[PDB]
Amino acid sequence: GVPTYGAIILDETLENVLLVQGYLAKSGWGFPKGKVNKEEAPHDCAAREVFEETGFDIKDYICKDDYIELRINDQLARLYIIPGIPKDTKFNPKTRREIRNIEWFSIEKLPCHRNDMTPKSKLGLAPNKFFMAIPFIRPLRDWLSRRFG
């Protein structure tokens, strides 16, 4: 699979993160990210995708050692961690055809797994509008514990 790069943007308090809402197959909330072009560097893909989806340029903020990276069905996804962005920042997707909304969310109130259906005696997971973000929440919390306390 083709690797994807993007960003976990936090506010000044480290309480809140920035999520984007897609359409159709991407109909819930996730971190801004996308597939890398041929010969494009990780950090440049990250800045490009985040800019298309939020109107915020992260080029001069990226720390090349500061990221979280997961494999998800044999696709690599790396999100660079960008702390200290004020909540009064104007965001503005370029691609209005891809992005329905942008909003800040409380990290402690976000879920880190989806719920089962054992109250109903049925296998699988109940739907969750944070499906795309969920895998990154627990790594993010641990990474923040370590780097800050």
Ligand SMILES: Cc1cc(=O)oc2c(CN(C)C)c(O)ccc12
């Ligand atoms: C929209 C856009 C196109 C592109 O190819 O690269 C970008 C980069 C990366 N460097 C500067 C080339 C940005 O930092 C910010 C925006 C873009």
